[PDB]
Amino acid sequence: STVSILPTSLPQIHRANMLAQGSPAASKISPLVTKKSKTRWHFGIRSRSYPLDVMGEIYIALKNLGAEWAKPSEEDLWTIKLRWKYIPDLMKMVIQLFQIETNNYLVDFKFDGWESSTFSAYPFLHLTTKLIMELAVNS
Amino acid sequence: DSQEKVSIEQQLAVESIRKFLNSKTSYDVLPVSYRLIVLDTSLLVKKSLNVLLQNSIVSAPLWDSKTSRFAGLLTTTDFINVIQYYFSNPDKFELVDKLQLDGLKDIERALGVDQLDTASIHPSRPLFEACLKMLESRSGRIPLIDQDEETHREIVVSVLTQYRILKFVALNCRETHFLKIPIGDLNIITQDNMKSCQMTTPVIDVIQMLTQGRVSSVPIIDENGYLINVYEAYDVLGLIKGGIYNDLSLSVGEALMRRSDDFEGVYTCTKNDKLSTIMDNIRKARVHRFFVVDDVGRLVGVLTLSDILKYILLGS
Amino acid sequence: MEYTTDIPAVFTDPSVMERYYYTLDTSWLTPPQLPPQLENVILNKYYATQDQFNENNSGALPIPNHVVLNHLVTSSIKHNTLCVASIVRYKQKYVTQILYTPIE
Ligand SMILES: Nc1ncnc2c1ncn2[C@@H]1O[C@H](COP(=O)(O)O)[C@@H](O)[C@H]1O
């Protein structure tokens, strides 16, 4: 076949041909180097405080943002079943506190549907962004 | 005797490709698990550029957190608009620097460019229908959009590209081998009114050719018509990254030094090449077009992905 | 279920948790241990397997665990931008929906 890569299109040859001609830009302009850092992903947010303290910070943040929640029982103290105002108008969330290490806890956030296989998490993601920011300020 | 056989095998391969396209949905093109990068509209333009470059993508759906709805696709066209606006208003550097994605429509109004009624397809629909719609996109990207089963809101599932369709075809239809008719005998190459420039042409003029001609790239030739390089809409992303205020009156040749070292190159072919070979290249590498050259390397035409799709769908 | 804006007494009044301690008869007094599915090494390998298939064409595409669906994924704030995500189901396929939003 006669399918090829045009050699003069490759950066190394193009640069060299511009340098050989004499144009100053050849020395001064450098190629774009996009350093793509390996992003570390985590579920939810970590806290170094202790259970009752953490749960207290969350509820305070929830209250100031205008959310409502169900009364928890003794078997599910570390679970928040909340509703947020933001066609169904009220978004449901489940927030769960987990223990990692002795001094380390993870706050898990879960979308739980709407109240009046194919769905958008973006309204959920937007609200959690507000919640994480509200929490970061109070700290 | 021999040209009769080549012809009927080509016909069989094409009928087979078309049936495949008629039997598959856009949903089928999707990987079993994949990522969808969406930008809030209040995000800065220059940060959105970094998000694209960091993630090795060239488009991203937009999300309006105020109205809780999708606000279209950020593409290289939006970035062309910004550079054109700045070049015409170099006093407004501060506005451009602090420009947010939702401010793009103000830039559009200031330049007088059309709204652009960007298409969409329901994933459940035949792939063949998404192909027909692809012949209208100049971006080469169309959002896959469904309905949220609870909010009834219109929502983005993915972004379909022409490359991805043609690669999906190539991977699943090895009958491409029997496309042995030289592309020169098919009348699928565009040869008339070739928009081109030279190495000394200022990059801003080349950028004007992209939107004024409705083309994704501009071939770069010497005085005698030899193909040397190309300037792509994609290159604009690196051009803004490396200083807009800096490269006001820079030549295309000079601007091309900003290209990353991982640039994969410009593909060329001749009139004697076959679509079997073309699809093989698409199968194995991201190729967006094949520039047709003669026996000595002079530019005679271009065969883009849209030309190949159009042949698959509509014929010669 | 009934909904209210009243913060549960156990987090605003020391008397409530104290009462629980003293009226003993165990695990409900402490938050559960983090499930192995939500560990950050499993989450990022899932990302790396998606990357290895698309950069090096090595292996197969990773199906996520059904446990982690609709749960929030986060990363460190960079350039005053919060990047959050959530793995959701679309028909029989899986979309990691990522959002970039500016913060203050
Ligand atoms: N620089 C160019 N000059 C003239 N025609 C072009 C150029 N680039 C692409 N085309 C043609 O314009 C149509 C759309 O181009 P594209 O958007 O690149 O697929 C195709 O039929 C191409 O063959």
Domain ranges of chain B: 1-180, 181-316
Please give the resolution of this entry in Å, rounded to 1 decimal.
2.3
Partner-chain contact B257 A4, CB within 8 Å? no
Partner-chain contact C38 A43, CB within 8 Å? yes
Indicate the residue of B250, B261, B268 with minimum beta-carbon distance to A11.
B261
- Whether B134 contacts B313, CB under 8 Å: no
User: Which helix H or strand E contains A79, and what residues bound it?
Assistant: strand A79-84
Scanning every residue of chain A, which has its alpha carbon at the shortest distance from the alpha carbon of C5?
A68
Partner-chain contact C81 B47, CB within 8 Å? yes
Q: Can you read off the two tokens belonging to residue A129?
A: 């962004």
C100 touches chain B (CB under 8 A): yes
Scanning every residue of chain B, which has its alpha carbon at the shortest distance from the alpha carbon of A23?
B254
CA distance A1 to A91: 59
C95: closest CA of chain A, how far (Å):
10
- Whether B277 contacts B182, CB under 8 Å: no
What's the half-sphere exposure (Cβ side, CA atoms, 13 Å) at B204? 14
Q: Which residues of A touch C85 (CB under 8 A)?
A: 41, 125
Label the pairing between strands B60-64 and B69-74.
Answer: antiparallel
Partner-chain contact B43 C102, CB within 8 Å? yes
Q: Which of C53, C73, C77, C95 to mutate to test the interface with B (most CBs of B within 10 A)?
A: C95
Return the CATH number at A59: 3.30.310.80
Classified by CATH at the fold level, domain B1-180 comes out as: CBS-domain (3.10.580)
C51: closest CA of chain B, how far (Å):
10
Ligand 1 atom with the smallest distance to the CA of B189 is 23
Architecture of the domain delimited by B181-316? Roll (3.10)
Cα B140 to its chain centre, rounded Å, is 4
- Whether B21 contacts B131, CB under 8 Å: yes
Q: What angle do CA B307, B60, A37 make, to 5 degrees?
A: 115
Going by the annotation, the residues of the binding site of B for AMP are 190, 195, 216-217, 304-307
What are the residues facing A92 on neighbouring strands? A83, A113
CA distance B314 to B307: 10
Best residue among B215, B300, B307, B314 to mutate for probing ligand 1's pocket (most ligand atoms within 8 Å of CB) is B215
Task: Enumerate residues lining ligand 1, CB below 6 A.
Answer: B 138, 190, 193-195, 215-219, 302, 304, 306-307
Scanning every residue of chain C, which has its alpha carbon at the shortest distance from the alpha carbon of A110?
C71
**For atom 23 of ligand 1, which residue has the closest CA?**
B190
- Whether B145 contacts B156, CB under 8 Å: yes
Q: Which of B28, B29, B36 to mutate to test the interface with C (most CBs of C within 10 A)?
A: B36
Closest CA to C46 of C55, C57, C37: C37
Q: Which of A38, A126, A129, A130 to mutate to test the interface with C (most CBs of C within 10 A)?
A: A129
Partner-chain contact A129 C103, CB within 8 Å? yes
Question: Where does residue B266 rank: exposed (0-12), middle (13-18), buried (19+ CB within 10 A)?
Answer: buried
CA distance B34 to B158: 9
Provide the angle, in degrees to the nearest 10, between the axes of the packed helices B305-314 and B127-134: 130
Scanning every residue of chain C, which has its alpha carbon at the shortest distance from the alpha carbon of B61?
C99
Q: Can you read off the two tokens belonging to residue B293?
A: 């050259």
Question: Is residue A67 helix, strand or coil?
Answer: coil
CATH of domain C68-104: 2.20.25.290
C101 touches chain B (CB under 8 A): yes
Partner-chain contact A14 B229, CB within 8 Å? yes
Q: Can you read off the two tokens belonging to residue A45?
A: 């947010």
Cα B189 to its chain centre, rounded Å, is 17
Distance from the alpha carbon of residue B58 to the mean position of ligand 1, in angstroms: 19
Which chains are within 8 Å of B by 3+ CB pairs? Answer: A, C
Other CB atoms within 10 Å distance of the CB of residue A39: 13
Question: Is residue A32 helix, strand or coil?
Answer: coil
Closest CA to B76 of B135, B124, B116: B116
- Whether A57 contacts A137, CB under 8 Å: no
Partner-chain contact C4 A60, CB within 8 Å? no
Distance from the alpha carbon of residue B99 to the mean position of ligand 1, in angstroms: 31
C7: closest CA of chain A, how far (Å):
6
Partner-chain contact C96 B42, CB within 8 Å? no
What are the residues facing B182 on neighbouring strands? B274
DSSP class of residue C34? P
Residue with tokens 């909340």: A82
- The contacts found for A87-92 with CB under 8 angstroms, 24 or more apart, are A87/A116, A87/B151, A87/B152, A88/A114, A88/A115, A88/A116, A88/B150, A88/B151, A89/A114, A89/A115, A89/A116, A90/A114, A90/A115, A90/A116, A91/A123, A91/A124, A91/A127
3-state helix, strand, coil in chain A (%, to 5): 35, 30, 35
